[PDB]
Amino acid sequence: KIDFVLSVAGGFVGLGNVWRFPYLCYKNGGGAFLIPYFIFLFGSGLPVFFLEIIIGQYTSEGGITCWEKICPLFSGIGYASVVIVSLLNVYYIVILAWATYYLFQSFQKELPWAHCNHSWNTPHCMEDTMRKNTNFTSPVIEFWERNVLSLSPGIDHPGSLKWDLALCLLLVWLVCFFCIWKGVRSTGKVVYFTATFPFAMLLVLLVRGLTLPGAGAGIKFYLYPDITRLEDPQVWIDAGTQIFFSYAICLGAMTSLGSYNKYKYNSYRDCMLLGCLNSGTSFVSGFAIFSILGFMAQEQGVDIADVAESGPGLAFIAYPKAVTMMPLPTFWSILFFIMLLLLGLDSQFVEVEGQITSLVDLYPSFLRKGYRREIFIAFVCSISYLLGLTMVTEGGMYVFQLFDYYAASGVCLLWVAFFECFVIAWIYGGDNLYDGIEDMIGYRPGPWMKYSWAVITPVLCVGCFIFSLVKYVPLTYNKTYVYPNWAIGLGWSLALSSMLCVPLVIVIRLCQ
Ligand SMILES: *[C@@H]1O[C@H](CO)[C@@H](O)[C@H](O)[C@H]1NC(C)=O
């Protein structure tokens, strides 16, 4: 029953809640992030999640073709989701590549980031333990910034392609290809492990984090807000994307997950449970990582807002620092990186299988099992690897950060979600959906969610977008570097490559 549904949904938590949420909550202050986080959650997250589940269940088609009989004129939501999930597959596998590199470098007796007496460290390096005794730098951040991937002075100098990371990325892609070769999703007792290990790892990390000194400052920074920061659109614009990324909203996956359920199945309670559980695990992981970050700041004796990198690498700077202090660091490090690989992989298979099925639905005659689908999967993996080689070279962090900020976040996700809510609440109508639910499942849901879809989400999205446009600021990596105009143009081209799908399909349909 409930144990079975939690066993099925154990794959809900992924690299999102464990990695992306911390650095998004850290880039622009922690306390000023929770208020728009929860506002956007209860305004759009659970509403749009439930909406995707209902559309996938009511209509047997799940994905691109769900909108074919709801509103054909707005069919571009599926294409936008396909483009967004393709870019997501492009830049998501790099996190797994870094995790694999750490796993391979963690088999040694002494962890590489324990000390910085190595051949890739400047003399200015100092051990953070002895730091309290404007040019010093902790060993972990220096290691992550040079040995893991060397940083050029800017994006204008791509440098030379790295080889060890390329090999790790190729290994991960080959593992994914050879696992989709057969398919190991159908599991018996293994689903118990695949659902218990991540939670146990997170729980022991939580215990370690809040049992460490200096966690109080991290908790206060995470919770206590700053009203003045709400005056900048960055906090709202990234709080309206982190919660959408966590639930895989608008990625075309949740609109097809509900297609497996039958007509008479109470999906309301399941959707509420998964949403609340995802929010809770994200919140507790935030406590853990901000506690370890506060401990890092306490030993480093520097301001919390700049103690660590304010970019995609926050997890790889906090979590290894946490497992370093745990007894027998090698064992816990190996287990943790296996956990990261398991979660990120499972997300990678769902993101990929969804994309492949969605694109095959476009041309069903081209690929009907056999070997043509096999070579198509091989081609997709090869092209994704080649494209991902761009952000793994020397100074590859800038391309990755820009592509993450402008690919599956920022304005594209809010754009897709706003049109989704607008069409569902202004052509199909919330009353019609409640009538269908009432005649479909037991109990009539409260009128809260129809008002939600009608007002709370579209107003929030439009206001955030316009408020960002008026107070336009360039995207900056970390806090001391500024992109050139052409880099921002490239990022905006990336975002438009997703956003323009809806107007393009609209005008094509209006032509005939
Ligand atoms: C050299 O590396 C060892 C290994 O951790 C370390 O204990 C020692 O402090 C380092 N010495 C210098 C001068 O970096």
Ligand SMILES: *[C@@H]1O[C@H](CO)[C@@H](O)[C@H](O)[C@H]1NC(C)=O
């Ligand atoms: C600072 O360095 C000196 C020199 O080794 C050492 O004696 C002292 O214990 C250090 N201070 C702390 C707080 O460890």
Ligand SMILES: *[C@@H]1O[C@H](CO)[C@@H](O)[C@H](O)[C@H]1NC(C)=O
């Ligand atoms: C250290 O940082 C300061 C700025 O705070 C800078 O003026 C100085 O050149 C840097 N290097 C050294 C060796 O002090």
Ligand SMILES: [Cl-]
């Ligand atoms: Cl989240």
